[PDB]
Coordinates of C-alpha atoms and ligand atoms in Angstrom, one line a residue:
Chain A
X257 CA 180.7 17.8 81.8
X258 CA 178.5 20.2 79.6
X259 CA 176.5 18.4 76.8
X260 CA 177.3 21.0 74.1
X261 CA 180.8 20.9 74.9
X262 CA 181.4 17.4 74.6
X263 CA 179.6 17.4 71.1
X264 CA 181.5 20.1 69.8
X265 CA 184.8 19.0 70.9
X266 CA 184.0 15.2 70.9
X267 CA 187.4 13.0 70.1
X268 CA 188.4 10.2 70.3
X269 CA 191.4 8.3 71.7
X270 CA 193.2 5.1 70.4
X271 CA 196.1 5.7 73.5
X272 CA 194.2 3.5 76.2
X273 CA 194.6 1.5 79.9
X274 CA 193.6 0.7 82.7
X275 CA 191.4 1.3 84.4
X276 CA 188.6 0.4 82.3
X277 CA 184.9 2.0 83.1
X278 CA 183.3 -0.6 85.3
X279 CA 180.1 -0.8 87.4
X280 CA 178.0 1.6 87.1
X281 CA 180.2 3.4 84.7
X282 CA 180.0 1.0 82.3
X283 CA 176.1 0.4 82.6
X284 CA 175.8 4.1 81.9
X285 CA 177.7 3.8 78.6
X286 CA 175.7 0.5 77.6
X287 CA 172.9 2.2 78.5
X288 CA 173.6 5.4 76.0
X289 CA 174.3 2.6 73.4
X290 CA 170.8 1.6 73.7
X291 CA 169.2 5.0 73.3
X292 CA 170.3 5.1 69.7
X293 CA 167.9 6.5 67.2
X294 CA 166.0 3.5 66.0
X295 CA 163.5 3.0 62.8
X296 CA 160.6 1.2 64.3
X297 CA 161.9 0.3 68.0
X298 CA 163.3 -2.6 66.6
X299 CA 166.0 -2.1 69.5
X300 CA 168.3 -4.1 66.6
X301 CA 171.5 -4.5 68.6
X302 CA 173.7 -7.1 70.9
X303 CA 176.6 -6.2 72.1
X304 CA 179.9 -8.1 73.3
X305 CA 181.8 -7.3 76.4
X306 CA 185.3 -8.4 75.8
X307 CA 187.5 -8.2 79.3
X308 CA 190.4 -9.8 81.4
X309 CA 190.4 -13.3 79.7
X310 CA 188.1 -12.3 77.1
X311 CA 190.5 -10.4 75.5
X312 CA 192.8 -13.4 75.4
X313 CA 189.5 -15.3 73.7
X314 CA 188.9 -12.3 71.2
X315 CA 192.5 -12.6 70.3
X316 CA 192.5 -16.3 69.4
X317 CA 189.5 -15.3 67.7
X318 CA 191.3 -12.5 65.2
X319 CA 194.1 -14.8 64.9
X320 CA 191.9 -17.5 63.4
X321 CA 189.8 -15.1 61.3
X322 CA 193.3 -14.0 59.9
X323 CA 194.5 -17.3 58.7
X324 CA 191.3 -18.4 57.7
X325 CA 191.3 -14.9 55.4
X326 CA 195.0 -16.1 53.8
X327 CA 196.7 -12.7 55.4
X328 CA 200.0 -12.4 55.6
X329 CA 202.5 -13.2 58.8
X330 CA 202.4 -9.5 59.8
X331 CA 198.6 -9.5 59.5
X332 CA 198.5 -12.7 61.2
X333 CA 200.3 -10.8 64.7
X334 CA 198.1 -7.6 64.2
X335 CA 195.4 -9.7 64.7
X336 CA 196.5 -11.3 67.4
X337 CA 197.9 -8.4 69.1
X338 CA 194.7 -5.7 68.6
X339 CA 192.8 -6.7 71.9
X340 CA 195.6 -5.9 74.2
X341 CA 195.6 -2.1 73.1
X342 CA 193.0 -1.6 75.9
X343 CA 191.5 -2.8 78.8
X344 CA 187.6 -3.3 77.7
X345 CA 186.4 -4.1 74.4
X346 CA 182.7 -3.9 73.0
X347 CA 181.6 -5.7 70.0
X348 CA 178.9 -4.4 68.1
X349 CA 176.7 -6.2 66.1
X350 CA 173.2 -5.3 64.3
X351 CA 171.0 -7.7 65.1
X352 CA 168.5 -7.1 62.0
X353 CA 164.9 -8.3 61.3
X354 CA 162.8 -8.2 57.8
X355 CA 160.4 -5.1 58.2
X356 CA 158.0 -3.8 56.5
X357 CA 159.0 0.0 56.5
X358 CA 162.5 -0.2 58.5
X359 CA 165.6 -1.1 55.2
X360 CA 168.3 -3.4 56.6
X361 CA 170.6 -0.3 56.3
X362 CA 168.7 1.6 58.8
X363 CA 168.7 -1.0 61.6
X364 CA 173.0 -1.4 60.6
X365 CA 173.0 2.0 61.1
X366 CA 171.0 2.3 64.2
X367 CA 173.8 0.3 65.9
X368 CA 176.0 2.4 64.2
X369 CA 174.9 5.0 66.4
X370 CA 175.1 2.9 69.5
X371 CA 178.5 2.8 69.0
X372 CA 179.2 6.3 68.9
X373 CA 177.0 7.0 72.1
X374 CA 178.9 4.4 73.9
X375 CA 182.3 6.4 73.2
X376 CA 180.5 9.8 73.6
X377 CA 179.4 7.9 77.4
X378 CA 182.5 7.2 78.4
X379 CA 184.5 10.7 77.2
X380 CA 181.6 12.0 79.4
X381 CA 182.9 9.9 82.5
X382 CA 186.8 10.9 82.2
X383 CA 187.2 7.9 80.0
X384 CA 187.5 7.9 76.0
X385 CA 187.5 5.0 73.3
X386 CA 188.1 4.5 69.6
X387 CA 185.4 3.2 67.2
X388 CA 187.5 0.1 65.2
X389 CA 186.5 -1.8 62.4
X390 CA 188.7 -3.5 59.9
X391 CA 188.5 -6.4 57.2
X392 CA 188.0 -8.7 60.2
X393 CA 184.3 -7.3 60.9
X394 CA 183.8 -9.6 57.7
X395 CA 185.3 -12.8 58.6
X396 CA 183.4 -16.0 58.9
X397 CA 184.9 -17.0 62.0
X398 CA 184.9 -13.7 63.5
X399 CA 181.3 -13.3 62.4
X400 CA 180.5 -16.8 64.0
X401 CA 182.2 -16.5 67.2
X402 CA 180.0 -12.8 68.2
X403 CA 176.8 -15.3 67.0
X404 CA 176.1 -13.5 63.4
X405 CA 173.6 -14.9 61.6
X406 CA 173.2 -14.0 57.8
X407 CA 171.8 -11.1 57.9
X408 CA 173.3 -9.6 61.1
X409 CA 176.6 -7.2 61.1
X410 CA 180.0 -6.7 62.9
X411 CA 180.0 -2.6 62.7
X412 CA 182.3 -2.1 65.1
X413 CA 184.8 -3.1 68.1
X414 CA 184.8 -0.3 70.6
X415 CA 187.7 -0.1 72.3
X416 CA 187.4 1.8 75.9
X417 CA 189.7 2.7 78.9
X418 CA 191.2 5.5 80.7
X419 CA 193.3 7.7 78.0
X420 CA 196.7 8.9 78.0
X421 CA 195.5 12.1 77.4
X422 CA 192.9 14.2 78.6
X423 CA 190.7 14.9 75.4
X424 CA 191.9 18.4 74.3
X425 CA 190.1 21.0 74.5
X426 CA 192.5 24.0 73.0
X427 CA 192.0 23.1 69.2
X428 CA 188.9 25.0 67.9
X429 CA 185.3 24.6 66.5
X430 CA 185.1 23.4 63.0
X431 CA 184.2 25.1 60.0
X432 CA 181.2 24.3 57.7
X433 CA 181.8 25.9 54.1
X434 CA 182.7 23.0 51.9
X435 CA 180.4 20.7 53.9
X436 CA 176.8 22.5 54.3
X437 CA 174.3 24.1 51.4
X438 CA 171.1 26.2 51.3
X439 CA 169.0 23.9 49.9
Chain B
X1468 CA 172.8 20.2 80.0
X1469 CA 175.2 16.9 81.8
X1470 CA 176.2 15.6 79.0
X1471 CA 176.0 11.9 80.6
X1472 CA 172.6 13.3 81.1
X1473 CA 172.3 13.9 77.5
X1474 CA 173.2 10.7 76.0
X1475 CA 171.1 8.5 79.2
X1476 CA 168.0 9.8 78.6
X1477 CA 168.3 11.5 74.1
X1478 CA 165.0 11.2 73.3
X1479 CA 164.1 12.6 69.5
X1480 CA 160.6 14.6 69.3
X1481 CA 158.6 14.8 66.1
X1482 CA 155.8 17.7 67.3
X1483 CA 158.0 20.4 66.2
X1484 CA 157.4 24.3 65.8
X1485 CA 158.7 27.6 65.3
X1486 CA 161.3 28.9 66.7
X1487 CA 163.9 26.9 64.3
X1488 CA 167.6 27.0 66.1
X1489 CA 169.1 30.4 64.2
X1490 CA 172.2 31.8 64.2
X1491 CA 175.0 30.6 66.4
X1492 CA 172.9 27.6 67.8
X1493 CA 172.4 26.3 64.3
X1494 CA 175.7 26.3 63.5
X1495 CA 176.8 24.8 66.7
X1496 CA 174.1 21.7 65.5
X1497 CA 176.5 21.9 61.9
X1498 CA 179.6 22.1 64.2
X1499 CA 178.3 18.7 66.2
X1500 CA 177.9 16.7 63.3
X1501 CA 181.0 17.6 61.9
X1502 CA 182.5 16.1 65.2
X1503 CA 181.2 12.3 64.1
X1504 CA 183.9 10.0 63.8
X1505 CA 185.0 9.2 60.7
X1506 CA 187.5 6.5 59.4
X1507 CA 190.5 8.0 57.4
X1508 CA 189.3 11.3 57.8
X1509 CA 187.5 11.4 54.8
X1510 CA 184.8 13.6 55.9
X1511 CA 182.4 11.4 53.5
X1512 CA 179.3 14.0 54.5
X1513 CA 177.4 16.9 53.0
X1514 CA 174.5 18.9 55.0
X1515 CA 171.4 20.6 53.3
X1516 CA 169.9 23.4 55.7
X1517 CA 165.9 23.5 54.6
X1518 CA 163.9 26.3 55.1
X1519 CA 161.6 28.6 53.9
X1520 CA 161.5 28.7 50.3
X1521 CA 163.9 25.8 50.5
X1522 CA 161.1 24.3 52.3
X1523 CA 158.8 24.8 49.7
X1524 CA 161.0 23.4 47.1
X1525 CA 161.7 20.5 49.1
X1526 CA 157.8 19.8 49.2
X1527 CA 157.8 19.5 45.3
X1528 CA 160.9 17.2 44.7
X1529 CA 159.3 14.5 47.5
X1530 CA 156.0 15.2 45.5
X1531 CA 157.9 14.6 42.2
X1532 CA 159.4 11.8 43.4
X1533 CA 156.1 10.2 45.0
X1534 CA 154.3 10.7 41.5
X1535 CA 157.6 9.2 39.3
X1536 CA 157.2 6.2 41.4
X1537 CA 153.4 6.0 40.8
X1538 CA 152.1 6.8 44.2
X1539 CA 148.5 7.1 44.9
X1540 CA 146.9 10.5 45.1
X1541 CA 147.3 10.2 49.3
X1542 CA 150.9 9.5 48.7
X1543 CA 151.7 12.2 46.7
X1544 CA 149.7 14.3 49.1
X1545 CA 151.7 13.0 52.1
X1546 CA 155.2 13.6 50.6
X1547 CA 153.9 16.9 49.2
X1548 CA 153.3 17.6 52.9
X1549 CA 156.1 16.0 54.9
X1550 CA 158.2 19.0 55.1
X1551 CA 156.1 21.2 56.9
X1552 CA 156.3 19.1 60.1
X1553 CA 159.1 21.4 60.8
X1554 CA 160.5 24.5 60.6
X1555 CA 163.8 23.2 59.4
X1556 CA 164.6 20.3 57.8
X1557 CA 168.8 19.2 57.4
X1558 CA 169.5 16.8 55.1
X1559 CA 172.2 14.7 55.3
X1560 CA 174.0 13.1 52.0
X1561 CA 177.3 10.5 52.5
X1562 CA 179.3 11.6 50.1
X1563 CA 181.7 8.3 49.6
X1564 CA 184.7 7.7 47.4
X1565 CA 186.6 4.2 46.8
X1566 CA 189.0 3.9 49.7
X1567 CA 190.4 -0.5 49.9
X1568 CA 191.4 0.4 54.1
X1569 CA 187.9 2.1 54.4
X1570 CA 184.3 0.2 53.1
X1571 CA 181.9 2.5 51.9
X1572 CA 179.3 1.3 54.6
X1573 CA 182.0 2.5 57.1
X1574 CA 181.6 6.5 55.2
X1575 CA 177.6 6.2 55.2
X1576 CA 177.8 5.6 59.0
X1577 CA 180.0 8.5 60.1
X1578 CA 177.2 10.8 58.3
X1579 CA 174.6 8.8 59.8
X1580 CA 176.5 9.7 63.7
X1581 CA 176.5 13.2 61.8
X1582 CA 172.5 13.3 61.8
X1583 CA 172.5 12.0 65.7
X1584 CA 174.8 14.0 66.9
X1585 CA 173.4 17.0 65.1
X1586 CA 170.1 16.0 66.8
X1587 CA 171.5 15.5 69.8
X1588 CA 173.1 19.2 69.6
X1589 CA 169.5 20.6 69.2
X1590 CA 168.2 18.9 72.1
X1591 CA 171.3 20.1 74.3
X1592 CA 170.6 23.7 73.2
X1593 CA 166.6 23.7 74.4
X1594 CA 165.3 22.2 71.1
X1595 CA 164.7 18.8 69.5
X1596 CA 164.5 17.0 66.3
X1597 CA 163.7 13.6 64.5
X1598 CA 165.8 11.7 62.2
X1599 CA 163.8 10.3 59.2
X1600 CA 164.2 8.6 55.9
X1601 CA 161.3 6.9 54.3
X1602 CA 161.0 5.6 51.0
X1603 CA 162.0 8.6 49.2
X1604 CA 165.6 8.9 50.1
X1605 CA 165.8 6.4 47.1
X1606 CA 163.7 8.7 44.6
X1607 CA 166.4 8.9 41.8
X1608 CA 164.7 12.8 41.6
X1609 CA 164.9 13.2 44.7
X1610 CA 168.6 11.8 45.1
X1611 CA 169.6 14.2 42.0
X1612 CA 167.9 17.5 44.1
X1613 CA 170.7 16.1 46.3
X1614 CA 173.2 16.2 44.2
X1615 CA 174.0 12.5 44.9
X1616 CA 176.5 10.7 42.9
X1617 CA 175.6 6.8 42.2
X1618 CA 178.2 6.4 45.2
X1619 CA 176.2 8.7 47.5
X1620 CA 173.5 8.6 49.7
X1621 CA 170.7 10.2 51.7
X1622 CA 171.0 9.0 54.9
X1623 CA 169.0 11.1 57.0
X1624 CA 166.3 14.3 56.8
X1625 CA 166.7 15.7 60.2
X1626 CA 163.3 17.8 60.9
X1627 CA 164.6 19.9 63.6
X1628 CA 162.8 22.6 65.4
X1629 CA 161.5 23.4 68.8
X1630 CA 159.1 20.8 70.9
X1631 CA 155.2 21.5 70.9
X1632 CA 154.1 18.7 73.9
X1633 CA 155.2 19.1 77.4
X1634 CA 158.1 17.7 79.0
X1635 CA 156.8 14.3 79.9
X1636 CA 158.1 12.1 83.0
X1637 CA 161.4 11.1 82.1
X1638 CA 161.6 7.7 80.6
X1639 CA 162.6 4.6 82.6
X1640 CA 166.3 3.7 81.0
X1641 CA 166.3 0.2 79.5
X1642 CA 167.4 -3.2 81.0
X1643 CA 171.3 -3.9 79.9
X1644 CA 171.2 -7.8 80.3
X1645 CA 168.4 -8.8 77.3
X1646 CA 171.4 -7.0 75.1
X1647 CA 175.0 -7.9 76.7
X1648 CA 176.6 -10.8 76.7
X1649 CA 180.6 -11.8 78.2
X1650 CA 182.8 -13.0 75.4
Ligands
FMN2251 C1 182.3 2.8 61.2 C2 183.7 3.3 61.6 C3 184.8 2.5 61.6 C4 186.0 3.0 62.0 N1 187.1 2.1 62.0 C5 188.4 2.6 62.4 C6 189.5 1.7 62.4 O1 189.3 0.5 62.1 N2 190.7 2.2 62.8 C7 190.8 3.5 63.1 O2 192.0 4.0 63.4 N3 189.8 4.4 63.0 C8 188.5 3.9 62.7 N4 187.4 4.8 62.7 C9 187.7 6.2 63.0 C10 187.8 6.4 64.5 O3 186.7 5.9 65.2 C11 188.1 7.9 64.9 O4 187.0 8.7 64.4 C12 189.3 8.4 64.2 O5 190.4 7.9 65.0 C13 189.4 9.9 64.3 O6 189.5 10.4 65.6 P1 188.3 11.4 66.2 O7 187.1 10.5 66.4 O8 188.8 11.9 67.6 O9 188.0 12.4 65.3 C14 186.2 4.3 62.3 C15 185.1 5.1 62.3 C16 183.8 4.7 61.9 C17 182.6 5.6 61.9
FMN2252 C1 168.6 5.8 60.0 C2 167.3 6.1 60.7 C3 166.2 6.4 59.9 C4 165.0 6.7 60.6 N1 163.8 7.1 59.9 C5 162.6 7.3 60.6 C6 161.5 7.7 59.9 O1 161.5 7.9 58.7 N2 160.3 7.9 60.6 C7 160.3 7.8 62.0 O2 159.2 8.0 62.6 N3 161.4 7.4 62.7 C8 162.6 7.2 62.0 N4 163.7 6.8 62.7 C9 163.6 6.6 64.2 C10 163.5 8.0 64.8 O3 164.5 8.9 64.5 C11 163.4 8.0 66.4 O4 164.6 7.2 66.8 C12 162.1 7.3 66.8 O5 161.0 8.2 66.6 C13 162.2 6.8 68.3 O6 162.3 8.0 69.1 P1 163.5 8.1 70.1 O7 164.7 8.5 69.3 O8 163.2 9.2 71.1 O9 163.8 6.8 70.9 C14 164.9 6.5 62.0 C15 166.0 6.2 62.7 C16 167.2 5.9 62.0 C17 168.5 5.5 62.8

């Protein structure tokens, strides 16, 4: 698939199954995840592959980071139900390091980036994902159970397989007035 | 280019020269960041296209905001001459508003996956670019050229612009296993 395509029309999909990338497929999208752009080459990332009983793992996980926030019943079950909306899950956490010239912000969002390359990889492959976050990226238990320390950050739970839908293609290019200035 | 070609092998480039992507290949590079994902759609991004005079004027708010801060003479000198390591220069400010369901980290990322992709979009279309920040992004003065609200903020300065060196062997792609772990 063309490279200026895919950015121009790049979407996302939250619709997900099986089959989720695997082999070689997935290694290419954990590979685009660690080509980010990163201040310094700190490579400030570790990411979390969350399959077959994994996802039952990263459920009980939620599920405890729910009650331990005081949510509700309803937020209780969303918890507990988000892993099962597809097939492969990949947690993202920056993994930062005090530096002299590199901000804390810039190494966050270096693995920002990864995320979005990892979804960009798979739409490349026939597969799509959806970039998630949510108040549980915050929660002590959740942070402890992908291995946080202090300063390290949840910044997203990627959430891969094979969509519904083939990305479309029909809707057309954005526009750029209310959004770009000559400086 | 493949566009799992693309995201395997993105390498940024700072020896950058004339020509500057023009016309319809710059604003395919605005149409790619525009594509960034984006939580609640609040499209939480601005872009600043620099170049030529803008250029010029560009030069003096770094080089106001180096000598505000009380830089040495060979700071002020260096931001004074940062801009002309490219031909164009697009800066990128997140524009964030108070939103409970979407954290304002969450908006600065989406226009920080606007400044990669928009690099990335470059490099698909026979040029390149580097994402940079430095110590400046903070300058109030240099914020307020901006037009950043105390909510806002410069993210990126993407010197963009077409490579000087020669294509170099292509890079061996990194080791997944130091980075990946099962949950
Ligand atoms: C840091 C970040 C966190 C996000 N978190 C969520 C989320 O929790 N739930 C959600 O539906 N979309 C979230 N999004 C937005 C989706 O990834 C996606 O962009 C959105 O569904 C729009 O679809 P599109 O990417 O095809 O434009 C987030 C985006 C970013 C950049
Ligand atoms: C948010 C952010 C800010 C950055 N700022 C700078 C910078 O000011 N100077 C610089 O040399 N690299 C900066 N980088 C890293 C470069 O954009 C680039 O990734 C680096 O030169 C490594 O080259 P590569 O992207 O080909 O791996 C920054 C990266 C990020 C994510």
């Amino acid at each position: 698939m063309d490279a200026l395509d895919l950015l121009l029309n790049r979407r996302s999909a939250s619709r997900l199954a099986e089959p989720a990338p695997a082999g070689e497929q997935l290694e290419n999208i954990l590979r685009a995840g660690l080509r980010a752009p990163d201040h310094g080459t700190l490579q400030p990332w570790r990411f979390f592959i969350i399959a077959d009983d994994g996802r039952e793992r990263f459920s009980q996980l939620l599920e405890k980071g729910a009650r331990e926030a005081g949510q509700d019943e309803k937020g209780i079950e969303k918890a507990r139900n988000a892993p099962f909306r597809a097939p492969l899950i990949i947690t993202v956490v920056a993994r930062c390091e005090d530096h002299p010239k590199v901000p804390r912000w810039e190494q966050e969002m270096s693995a920002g980036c990864a995320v979005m390359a990892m979804q960009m990889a798979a739409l490349a492959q026939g597969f799509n994902g959806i970039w998630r976050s949510g108040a549980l990226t915050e929660s002590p238990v959740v942070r402890a159970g992908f291995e946080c320390r202090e300063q390290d950050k949840i910044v997203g739970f990627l959430y891969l397989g094979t969509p519904q839908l083939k990305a479309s293609t029909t809707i057309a290019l954005p526009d750029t007035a209310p959004f770009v200035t000559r400086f």
